[model samples]
Target: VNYCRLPCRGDNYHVGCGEPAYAQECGQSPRTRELLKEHRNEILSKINDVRDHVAKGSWGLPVAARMKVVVWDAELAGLAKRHTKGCVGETHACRNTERFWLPGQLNFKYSGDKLPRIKELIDDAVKKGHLQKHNITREIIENYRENGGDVKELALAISDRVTAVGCGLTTWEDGAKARALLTCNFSSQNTRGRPVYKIGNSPGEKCIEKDETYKNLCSATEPIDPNKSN
Candidate 1:
C-alpha cells in the first residue's frame, strides 16, 4: 500500500490519500499500513467477529467489503474476486500456480509455469496422509528429533503436512509467524474444536499472534447441522 516517488522530486510536500472503499478516502494515501503495523494487535482483537460469521456459514456470502464493491468500485472488486479460487477450476489453478504461490497472500502476480511442481506437491500430500485431520503436538515433533530425526527435514515434512490439510499450500516466509497457519480451524465439527488444520497466514498477520483478535480466529469452530446427518 506504500507508494513512494523518487527523492529527486524537489517539492517536499507529499499529498497523502487512502482509498476507504468502506468509508471516505483517507485523503491521498495516508499511512494506513503504518497504522496497521502499529496497532495491528488492537485491530485483530476481534477476529471472532469473522470466525463467528464464518462458522455460521455466512463467510462466503459477502459482507460490507463485498457490498461496497457492488455499490462503489466494481473493477477493484473484480480484482478481489481473483483472490480465491472457486469450486469449478480451483484444482487446475492450484496445480498451475503451486510453485509461484508462497503460502500467504503475499503476491498475486500470476504465473503459468508452476503446474508440474504443484501437481507433485498435491501428490505428495496424498501419499503422506497430510490431507487429513492431524494434530501436531509438541511431543510428537520432539520425539522425532530425539530419535535422530533431522530437525530441518522434520520441519519441512510437517510444513508439507500443513499444506496438505489446507489444500496445496506449503511455503512460509518466516517460520515463527507461519505457525498460525498450522493451527487455525478451517473445516469444523471434524476436528472436535481443535485447530487441526492450517489455513496459512495473512501477510497482515504473518508470523505473529500477539493480537487477541487472532485468538478468536484461531480457536473458532463451526458446527454441522444435525438434521443433515439424518
Candidate 2:
C-alpha cells in the first residue's frame, strides 16, 4: 500500500494505517514502512524453508492424475491508471480514487449498466454446462460492481474454455518467489493442458511439458482429501 499525500496531509496521517492500509502521519509513516519490511523478511524466511525442504526431497506428488498447477497474484482488475470506466453514480465516494483494494473488498464505484450483461454471459455459460450455476451468485455480481466491470468483455468471451491470461511474479504465503503463468483456457478437449504450439521468438513447437525450468517449479495443486475418493 503506497502512501497518498492527499489522505495523509497535515495531522490526518493516521487515517489508513495497517497491513493493506496506510497512514501518512508523523511516526505512522515510518512505522508502516517498518512493518512492511518485517513482514517481507518473515515471508522470505518461510519461503527459504520450503526451498530447503524441497532440496532434501521432503515432498510428495499429487495422489490423483494431474496436469499443471499455478500460483501467483491475480491482478484481474489491472491497475488504477488502466481503468477505462468512470464512476457509476453522481457521487465520487468510491474507493476507485485509491489505487488498491483488499481481497473480497468491493469498489462501490461501478455503474450497474453492465451488471445484467455480465449476468447474461454467466447464465449462458452455466446453461451450456461450461460453468457451475451456483458459482455465479449474487456475490459475483457484487464483485463486478466493485471492480467497475472493466473486464466484462474479457469475461464474456469465455464459454467452457479459458478466456484470459495473467503473468506475473508473486510472493506466495510461504514467502517464496514464484512465477505465475496462468490462462483461462481450460477446455475439456485439452483437459490436461494447453495446445503444443509456438509462433514467435522462442521457436520450435513445444508443449508445456517441454519447459524443464517450469517443470521443476512447485505447483499449487488442490490437496487430496483422504476422506474423499480420488
Candidate 3:
C-alpha cells in the first residue's frame, strides 16, 4: 500500500518499502550511546544527504523510491570502533556484513568537523565511482559482490535497504605516523539482486507517504527515529 515501489502492476509491490519490520536497538554502553547521541545528527545527516543524492540519481541510473531514511544504530559504532582502533585487517573482516565511512585524517570529535569529515567520506565514495557501480547482483552464489572495501562499503552506504548506522571516530598512531581513523557500521547487508530501492523517482517524489523528518524521502508513518536510544 503506502511506500510501495515502482511497477505497482498486478500486486507486484504491495509489500511496502524495502525497510525491515523489526525494531532495531542500540547495544552500546551508556557512555558510548551518549557519544553517539551527541554527534548522531551531524553524522547521520552527512550520510542521508549523500544518500539523498543517490536516491535522486545524482550520479546517474536507477533512482531510488523507497530509499529508507536510515536511522542510527550505536551498536554498529561500537563494532566499528574496535576495528578502527586495531586499524588492521579489512573493514569487513568482522562478521557484520549485514550492514559501513573513513574520511577524516586530520580530525575527530573535539574538532567539530564531524559533518565535514563525513562529507569527505561520501565524496570519496562518490569520486571513487563506488556509488555508481552495482554492488548487488542476482546471481545467488555467483554474485561477484563480495566483501571488498570502497565498492561494497560505499554501495552499502547508498543502499536503500540499509536502515541503521553508527560511527566510531578516533585519532591513533601507526608506526610513527599520525593517523585519524573514522569508521562507521551499518545494520543490514546488501544481498544479491535486492533492487537497492524500488526503481522510481527521487526519494520522496511520489511516496504513498512521506517521512516527516525527511520531506523528500518517503516516510512509513513514523519512521524510525535516528536518535532512538537503548
Name the best candidate (by TM-score).
Answer: 3
lDDT of 2 by residue, 28-141 (tens): 211111113333233223322332222222223111112222222233222211111211112122221132221111121211222223223223323333222223223332
Scanning candidate 1 in windows of ten residues, the lowest lDDT window is: 63-72
TM-score, predicted candidate 1 vs. hidden true structure: 0.17
- Tell me how far the alpha carbon of residue 85 in candidate 2 is from the true structure, in angstroms, after superposition: 26
Off by over 4 Å in 1: 1-33, 36-38, 59-101, 106-230
What total of clashing residue pairs does each candidate reach? Answer: 10, 7, 5
lDDT of 3 by residue, 1-230 (tens): 22343232243332223442211121121112123354677667766776676676655545666666767765566555544444332322322322222111111222222224444543443344443345433231123254543355556666555667766654433333333445565665555544444567556655667666665566544253222211
Q: Which candidate leads in lDDT?
A: 3
lDDT of 1 by residue, 147-186 (tens): 2332221122222112111121222222222110111111
**What TM-score does structure 3 among the candidates reach?**
0.54
Q: How high is each candidate's TM-score?
A: 0.17, 0.18, 0.54
* Model 3: worst 10 consecutive residues (lDDT sum): 22-31
Q: What are the lDDT figures for the candidates, one per model?
A: 0.22, 0.23, 0.47
- Model 2 has an lDDT value of 0.23
